[PDB]
Design a protein around this ligand. Structure first.
Ligand code: CLA
Ligand code: CLA
Ligand code: CLA
Ligand code: CLA
Ligand code: CLA
Ligand code: CLA
Ligand code: CLA
Ligand SMILES: CCCCCCCCCCCCCCCC(=O)OC[C@H](COP(=O)(O)OC[C@@H](O)CO)OC(=O)CCCCCCCCCCCCCCC
Ligand SMILES: CC(=O)O[C@H]1CC(C)(C)C(=C=C/C(C)=C/C=C\C(C)=C/C=C\C=C(C)\C=C\C=C(/C)C(=O)C[C@@]23O[C@]2(C)C[C@@H](O)CC3(C)C)[C@](C)(O)C1
Ligand SMILES: CC1=C(/C=C/C(C)=C/C=C/C(C)=C/C=C/C=C(C)/C=C/C=C(C)/C=C/C2=C(C)CCCC2(C)C)C(C)(C)CCC1
Ligand SMILES: CC1=C(C/C=C(\C)CCC[C@H](C)CCC[C@H](C)CCCC(C)C)C(=O)c2ccccc2C1=O
Ligand code: SF4
Lengths: 29, 75, 160, 40, 33, 62, 732, 80
């Protein structure tokens, strides 16, 4: 069963993707 | 109509605009119907019956089939 | 048989269909009576039904499981009546019409008013030209080998 | 007469007559040779 | 608890986020650099 | 040769009557850019039956 | 520019709302942006591709995560044929208590059942626990981040690739064919042999023991010794129960042919062998072009030398090399076309040769997947032709391609278009005519007078591969045929069993009814093609507008003169073809669904007899199978199909709304908007607020696009609800 | 805004300048035609894109071509 810690870890990873996505978008602009 | 569709689909029938929930009755029309029903003998003294049984009256049947009947108005 | 089908003469479903159809009409006729015009009509209709099924039975048509006739068109001459033979008829008639039409258009093209003769046909000429289409196959081939049918890049074309 | 014949020679009129004739002959064929799905 | 996340994130993703995004787009398209 | 009453074939690709035959009506001799005036028996998409072409755009057909 | 469309001064200096609308829809046409150099174009496109890849991986990660956190994969694994797969949970604050109960049926919380087939795929590939799925999701999230970094990196000054790098065809093809496709396949067979096959037989091989759990008892000894036959010995018995060791074997690479008896799906060993073979083929093919090592072929030379000596094809393929390398639109068109064919093939071959376990028994999922890929295929096909036209208008050089194979195509354009027209007419008249004949006679009560042609040619092909029902004793259907003798001891045994089993979709039985529908599909393809092909060929000019090339791919019209020039641009061909594409795909999907529905229901006869006339389709298919859907919510209650019911009606709305844009044109609306402006400026209180972008009506082309989108979205949504609710409501 | 171009095939019929709803075209002296006149587009800033001019041209292919382009208040015919 996916533990809370596991879910929280996933969310942290997603955040990294988001910040790296904004940059790519702003670099393409 | 769209409101009602959404409500019935979401399992919330008590929130629909229906005669069993929030109701939107045609009060004005219901009133005129009564006026026309009671006209014979009053506002139309020499008449003997309603111009139409739609406004009100009895059910006229011919051959076991209904010819005309009072038509009621609701939500 | 071809495709696992069965000859209609030997298909039980086909016969069942026949019996059922006739029964329906007969049941209707029962209501009417004797020589009543309605009854006589229904009676005549059953005769036609019986005839149709019989014709198909005597034919070479192949029926399927539903008891309905299925047509074969792979080129076999065993079942040529189904498509090949009727097909020739269409080609002959269609070519006739097309050939005669082209002939008339080309014929009236050199007239005083080539556009009035398209809205108001010259019946006498048309009839003459129409009768000359029975030999369209021969005429067409002759025109092809005489370089009189197909044109040669002297026709309008698009910009590109 | 000549003028009337021209009117009768107009495209619309001729089409109707021709199609009526064609339709009629097809109907008549089916009346005498009915129910055919193949040349027998 | 992670189980509470559906009730804490959905309100934000479907209401707060779209609003701010639309506002920013409007301000971006209505500005004359 | 292009001359009054001569028949020619259009060679202008933009023309509605490209690769078609027309009859030269008149050829102007004042040095205008498009001297020849050809007439056709078919109207264009606009409804005209005439246009002026240069001698090079026209080839005599006979 | 200093306004929203920074890439366009023209739009930026526009005083109306068009500035906003157009800027959004002209954002990805990087080639037309103000001040665009070819080098920058390629570099930006490359980076954009990295972003797309990242989105795809994030999407996959989400599915794994939600299935793992809110699904029932492990339970499904235990009882695959008695559990409904869960996609994700539902938290809608608008739901009523009743809805919470209905959607929570079979579980303890409101949930959505998946019809994507992920469970079967993952089960087949080796996944057995939720923790495993979690690891996968986390990994993909990381990979997504890496891809985003790459996009930024290659847009930096010292890492921007040169234009030459972007045009080195030989190296890319060699690498992509040998590495992207070839080595990847080799890697996949590795996974199948090391993880999947062991799992099917009950053994767990994971990152914890893969280095110590040999895939085959013999080892890699047979491989290097050359005794490869050892890896095909002892195939799983016919009594093998999947996911368990009972009746298991040891074979890893085999050519059994057919389906596993219990799972009714292709054998895993065969798939492993398949990918291994494909690998070698691609790796070898990737060594054909010259790449800084001396050996190899030069593509330009190959193309130039190919000119038929007879001269029937003119100068041949000379000049095409430069045209393709210098045109991104042609490249995209070629790609979209090939991918479109691939998508259709996936749909056709996946329902016959079931690849995943217990997928055949899930009717709804099987139906969704087919309709999904077929629709995607249509869009991909139409796009190919669209970009082909864009190429002619923008990148075609008439001089370079002189008497080339491509130029000569534009020389006999009339011939192609005219003949395609005839084909469409022939197919249309007779197909419709025969259907109507059958309808009339049946209506008059004389079904025996129907014109029903047996599909003999197709039946022959089925027999050629082994089918025996048709009684055509040919090829593999003949015991004396040389072909039968060849494979009788190789793969035929298993194949001849499946092909001749009535409970499989391998070469389903065909009848007179299938003949007609196939000819209708033919009409669709031909007519859709006509529109698209004409658009491409007549994109650089026509008799009506001999100068079309100077106006572009998309322009409103050319005026009310010369007879009227509405919808004369090439873009309009795409617009018109979209409708036909949807129609044809619709016919194809309807056919698949109805045929299968009757088969699943146990009454194959209904299709066989009622498919001959149109009324049958309307009454015995659309009307009959709509009962579950239209009763998702009624005056007496609701069920889990309520969402699907609501969407069905929603689709109809969007579709019809589209009609407004398609039939009503700009003039009327512009005048009406003017009146509204007057009102706002003259109404007190509201006068305080004013616009900064003059309110104007939508443009001609814009309305066409908006309308097509509304029509398309409604089309897909409505059918999506039907195919799912009807199948699930009846068989699930 | 929009771009209007005149080609050498003009015959000085003046029909185009008589059809413009916003006075964008004029007739200027010229020697390439018998009429001795050619059309010009001095005020394209007032072209609305009607294409009435093109509809009036008698030449095989329009000698006056209007290519729609950047849009302004004037070109969009906005009285508001
Ligand atoms: C591509 C499809 C195709 C085409 C174009 C044809 C074409 C033809 N077939 Mg045919 N055929 C086909 C598939 C096809 N077949 C298949 C799949 C089968 C097996 C069911 C047959 C079985 C078949 C038979 C048994 C016969 C033909 C015959 C013929 C020919 C008709 C006779 C004539 O003069 O004309 C014609 C060339 C006839 C023939 O050759 O006559 C000499 C004939 O007797 N065909
Ligand atoms: C007798 C006249 C005639 C002839 C010989 C042809 C011949 C041809 N047409 Mg054409 N056509 C015609 C009339 C004719 N057309 C008319 C009137 C129309 C307008 C409805 C068309 C519309 C048309 C299209 C849209 C297409 C063709 C195509 C074709 C070619 C393939 C054959 C085909 O499928 O035709 C099919 C013909 C029709 C569907 C037209 C209907 C039949 C007409 C009405 C019969 C006319 C008979 C005439 C009224 C008799 C009066 C003469 C009498 C007084 C003597 C072929 C070159 C196709 C092509 O280019 O392929 C290469 C194609 O795509 N035609
Ligand atoms: C694109 C993939 C995708 C999609 C469509 C969804 C969809 C959904 N998620 Mg989900 N999720 C995903 C990936 C995805 N997830 C991943 C990778 C994670 C791990 C971090 C999660 C973790 C997660 C949690 C913990 C919860 C949801 C919930 C939900 C539901 C409500 C929406 C919400 O609150 O989102 C919130 C989602 C997040 C905050 C996760 C981060 C956002 C992801 C990574 C965005 C992916 C980028 C994407 C490609 C952008 C596309 C742009 C495109 C439109 C142009 C909805 C069904 C909620 C739920 O179950 O409701 C019942 C909930 O509580 N998600
Ligand atoms: C994912 C997005 C989302 C979410 C979470 C909700 C949530 C809700 N909607 Mg809803 N809605 C949505 C999208 C969404 N909607 C959309 C897209 C539409 C358009 C079709 C609607 C149209 C709609 C209608 C027409 C109605 C709702 C109502 C409701 C509420 C019913 C439950 C309740 O207890 O009501 C009782 C209400 C409360 C207990 C009050 C809760 C406190 C409020 C919501 C605080 C809002 C402050 C918020 C931060 C301000 C936003 C700032 C801005 C910058 C974003 C609930 C809060 C009903 C309602 O009562 O609205 C409030 C209602 O009548 N919705
Ligand atoms: C071995 C080295 C290698 C590898 C692995 C790759 C891999 C890749 N490159 Mg590439 N590249 C290489 C070397 C390599 N390159 C070199 C040396 C150069 C310089 C010359 C380039 C220059 C380059 C450019 C310029 C671009 C790429 C891009 C890409 C990506 C393509 C998008 C994608 O993920 O699709 C992968 C898709 C799959 C694996 C699925 C394949 C599905 C097909 C349909 C299978 C078909 C099977 C079979 C044939 C079907 C049979 C039926 C049929 C008959 C119908 C991919 C990751 C593109 C990209 O996105 O960059 C970010 C891009 O724009 N590359
Ligand atoms: C790899 C695939 C691929 C790529 C890279 C491109 C790339 C391109 N295409 Mg292309 N195209 C493709 C596939 C592709 N296309 C396919 C499959 C088709 C067939 C449909 C087309 C059809 C097509 C046409 C007809 C045109 C292009 C054009 C273009 C260029 C500009 C695109 C643009 O302006 O969009 C900018 C951004 C947008 C338009 C945003 C899209 C918004 C969409 C339409 C609506 C979204 C759906 C809806 C909102 C869903 C909500 C439903 C909800 C309620 C449930 C660009 C070079 C245009 C061009 O001129 O190029 C020269 C052009 O005219 N393409
Ligand atoms: C029910 C709707 C419908 C129908 C029937 C058609 C029919 C047709 N469209 Mg069409 N279309 C439609 C909707 C429809 N469209 C919509 C909504 C769009 C918007 C995208 C388009 C866009 C479109 C384009 C862009 C094109 C077509 C084309 C065609 C023609 C294709 C050739 C064909 O089938 O010949 C057969 C035609 C028919 C069977 C239809 C008419 C049938 C009548 C009743 C005659 C029947 C005769 C009968 C058999 C007996 C004859 C003998 C008798 C006289 C005794 C055909 C006339 C193409 C074209 O021009 O053709 C080359 C083409 O390029 N359509
Ligand atoms: C399927 C869609 C097709 C589009 C893509 C494929 C392009 C089509 C081109 C493929 C081959 C070219 C065909 C013709 C174009 C052509 O004529 O080129 C002829 C060409 C030879 O010419 P070359 O230019 O290549 O050679 C020049 C000479 O100098 C030789 O040195 O090839 C052939 O010889 C084909 C002859 C065999 C044909 C096999 C016939 C067998 C049965 C068919 C006949 C049935 C009759 C029944 C009796 C009633
Ligand atoms: C258009 C196209 O695709 O063309 C391509 C095709 C292709 C094939 C890719 C090409 C290639 C590469 C080559 C050279 C292909 C040729 C041949 C190939 C495929 C591979 C090579 C050698 C194999 C050997 C030497 C055998 C080892 C095998 C040995 C030593 C053994 O037999 C072991 C064994 O004996 C024991 C000891 C005892 C026996 O009881 C058991 C056996 C008998 C098994 C081409 C020709 O370059 C171009
Ligand atoms: C517009 C355009 C374009 C496009 C085009 C297209 C889109 C095309 C498509 C095309 C297509 C879409 C094609 C298809 C094809 C197909 C084929 C070609 C097939 C074949 C087949 C074969 C060869 C055979 C097979 C087989 C085998 C193998 C064995 C036996 C059986 C059989 C059948 C199966 C471009 C961009 C280029 C540019 C120019 C213009
Ligand atoms: C209804 C209709 C309109 C008018 C439709 C309009 C004006 C749509 C207006 C509503 C849409 C949803 C835009 C509203 C946007 C909001 C005001 C928010 C904008 C925020 C910005 C930052 C984007 C046309 O302009 C038209 C043109 C040509 C053919 C047919 C038609 C047609 O049928
Ligand atoms: S789009 Fe407008 S101007 Fe152009 S032809 Fe149609 S109605 Fe006339």
């Amino acid at each position: 069963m996916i533990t809370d810690f596991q879910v929280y870890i996933a969310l942290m990873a997603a955040l990294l993707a988001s910040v790296l996505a904004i940059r790519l978008g702003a670099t393409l602009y | 109509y769209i409101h009602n569709d959404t409500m019935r689909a979401l399992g919330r029938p008590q929130d629909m605009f229906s005669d069993k929930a929030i109701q939107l009755q045609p009060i004005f029309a219901q009133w005129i119907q009564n006026i026309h029903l009671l006209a014979p003998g009053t506002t139309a003294p020499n008449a003997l019956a309603t111009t139409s049984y739609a406004f009100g009256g009895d059910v006229i049947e011919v051959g076991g089939k209904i010819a005309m009947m009072p038509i009621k108005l609701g939500t | 048989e071809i495709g696992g089908l069965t000859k209609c003469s030997e298909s039980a479903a086909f016969t069942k269909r026949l019996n059922a159809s006739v029964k329906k009409l007969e049941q209707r006729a029962s209501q009417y009576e004797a020589d009543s015009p309605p009854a006589l009509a229904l009676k005549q209709q059953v005769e036609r039904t019986q005839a149709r099924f019989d014709k198909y039975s005597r034919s070479e048509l192949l029926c399927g499981a539903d008891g309905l006739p299925h047509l074969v068109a792979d080129g076999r001459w065993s079942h040529a009546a189904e498509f090949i033979l009727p097909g020739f008829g269409f080609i002959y008639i269609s070519g006739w019409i097309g050939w005669v039409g082209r002939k008339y258009l080309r014929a009236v093209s050199t007239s005083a008013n080539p556009s009035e003769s398209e809205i108001i046909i010259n019946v006498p000429l048309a009839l003459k030209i129409m009768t000359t289409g029975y030999i369209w196959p021969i005429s067409a081939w002759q025109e092809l080998i005489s370089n009189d049918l197909v044109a040669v890049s002297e026709e309008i074309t698009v910009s590109p | 007469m000549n003028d009337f014949q021209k009117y009768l020679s107009t495209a619309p009129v001729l089409l109707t007559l021709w199609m009526t004739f064609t339709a009629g002959f097809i109907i008549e064929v089916n009346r005498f040779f009915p129910d055919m799905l193949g040349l027998y | 608890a992670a189980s509470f996340l559906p009730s804490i994130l959905v309100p934000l993703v479907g209401l707060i986020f779209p609003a701010f995004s639309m506002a920013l787009f409007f301000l971006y398209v209505q500005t004359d650099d | 040769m292009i001359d009054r009453n001569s028949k020619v074939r259009i060679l202008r690709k933009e023309s509605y009557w490209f690769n078609q035959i027309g009859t030269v009506a008149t050829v102007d001799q004042s040095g205008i850019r498009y001297p020849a005036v050809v007439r056709f028996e078919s109207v264009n998409y606009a409804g005209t039956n005439t246009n002026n072409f240069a001698l090079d755009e026209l080839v005599e057909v006979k | 520019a200093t306004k929203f469309p920074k890439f366009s001064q023209a739009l930026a200096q526009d005083p109306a709302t068009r500035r906003i609308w157009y800027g959004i829809a002209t954002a990805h046409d990087l080639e037309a942006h103000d001040g665009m150099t070819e080098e920058n174009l390629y570099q930006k496109i490359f980076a954009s591709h990295f972003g797309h890849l990242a989105i795809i991986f994030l999407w996959t990660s989400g599915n794994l995560f939600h299935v793992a956190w809110q699904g029932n994969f492990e339970k499904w694994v235990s009882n695959p044929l008695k559990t409904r797969p869960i996609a994700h949970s539902i938290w809608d604050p608008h739901f009523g208590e009743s809805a919470l109960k209905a959607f929570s049926k079979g579980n303890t919380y409101p949930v959505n059942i998946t019809f994507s087939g992920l469970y079967q795929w993952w089960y087949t590939i080796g996944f057995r626990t939720n923790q495993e799925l979690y690891k996968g999701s986390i990994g993909l999230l990381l990979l997504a981040s890496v891809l985003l970094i790459a996009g930024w990196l290659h847009l930096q000054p010292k890492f921007r690739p040169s234009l030459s790098w972007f045009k080195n065809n030989e190296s890319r093809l060699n690498h992509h064919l040998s590495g992207l496709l070839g080595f990847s396949s080799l890697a996949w067979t590795g996974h199948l042999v090391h993880v999947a096959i062991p799992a099917s037989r009950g053994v767990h091989v994971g990152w914890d023991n893969f280095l110590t759990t040999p895939p085959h008892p013999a080892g890699l000894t047979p491989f290097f010794t050359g005794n490869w036959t050892v890896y095909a010995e002892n195939p799983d018995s016919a009594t093998h129960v999947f996911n368990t060791s009972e009746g298991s074997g040891t074979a890893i690479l085999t050519f059994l042919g057919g389906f596993h008896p219990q799972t009714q799906s292709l054998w895993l060993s065969d798939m492993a062998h398949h990918h291994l073979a494909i690998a070698v083929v691609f790796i070898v093919a990737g060594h054909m072009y010259r790449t800084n090592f001396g050996i190899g072929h030069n593509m330009k030379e190959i193309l130039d030398a190919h000119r038929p000596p007879g001269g029937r094809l003119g100068a041949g393929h000379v000049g095409l090399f430069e045209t393709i390398t210098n045109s991104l639109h042609m490249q995209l068109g070629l790609a979209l076309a090939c991918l479109g064919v691939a998508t259709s093939l996936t749909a056709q071959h996946m329902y016959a040769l079931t690849p995943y376990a217990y997928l055949s028994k899930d009717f709804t999922t099987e139906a969704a997947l087919y309709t999904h890929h077929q629709y995607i295929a249509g869009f991909l096909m139409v796009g190919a032709f669209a970009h082909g036209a864009i190429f002619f208008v923008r990148d075609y050089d008439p001089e370079l391609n002189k008497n080339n194979v491509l130029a000569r195509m534009l020389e006999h354009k009339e011939a192609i278009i005219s003949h395609l027209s005839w084909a469409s007419l022939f197919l249309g008249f007779h197909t419709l005519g025969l259907y109507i004949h059958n309808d009339t006679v049946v209506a008059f009560g004389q079904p025996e007078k129907q014109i029903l042609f047996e599909p003999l040619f197709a039946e022959y092909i089925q027999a050629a591969s082994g089918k025996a029902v048709y009684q055509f004793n040919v090829l593999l259907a003949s015991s004396t045929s040389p072909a039968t003798a060849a494979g009788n001891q190789v793969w035929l045994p298993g194949w001849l069993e499946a092909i001749n089993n009535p409970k499989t979709d391998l070469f389903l039985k065909i009848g007179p009814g299938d003949f007609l529908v196939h000819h209708a599909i033919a009409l669709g393809l031909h007519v859709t093609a006509l529109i698209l092909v004409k658009g491409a060929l007549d994109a650089r000019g026509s008799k009506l507008m001999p100068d079309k090339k100077d106006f572009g791919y998309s322009f409103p019209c050319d005026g009310p003169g010369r007879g009227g020039t509405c919808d004369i641009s090439a873009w309009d061909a795409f617009y018109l073809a979209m409708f036909w594409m949807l129609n044809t795909i619709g016919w194809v999907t309807f056919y698949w669904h109805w045929k299968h529905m009757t088969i699943w229901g146990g009454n194959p006869g209904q299709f066989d007899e009622s498919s001959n006339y149109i009324m049958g389709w309307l009454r015995d298919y659309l009307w009959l199978n709509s009962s579950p859907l239209i009763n998702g919510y009624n005056p007496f209650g609701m069920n889990n199909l309520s969402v699907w019911s609501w969407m069905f009606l929603f689709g109809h709305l969007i579709w019809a709304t589209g009609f407004m844009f398609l039939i009503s044109w700009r003039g009327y609306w512009q005048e009406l908007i003017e009146t509204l402006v007057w009102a706002h400026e003259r109404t007190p209180l509201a006068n305080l607020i004013r616009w900064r972008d003059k309110p104007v009506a939508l443009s001609i082309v814009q309305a066409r696009l908006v309308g097509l989108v509304h029509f398309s979205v409604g089309y897909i949504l409505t059918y999506a609800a039907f195919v799912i609710a009807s199948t699930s409501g009846k068989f699930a | 805004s929009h771009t209007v171009k005149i080609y050498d095939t003009c015959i000085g019929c003046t029909q185009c300048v008589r059809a413009c709803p916003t006075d964008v075209l004029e007739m200027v002296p010229w020697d390439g035609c018998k009429s001795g006149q050619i059309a010009s587009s001095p005020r394209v800033e007032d072209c609305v894109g009607c294409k009435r001019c093109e509809t009036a041209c008698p030449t095989d292919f329009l000698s006056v071509r209007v290519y729609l382009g950047a849009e302004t208040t004037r070109s969009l015919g906005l009285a508001y």
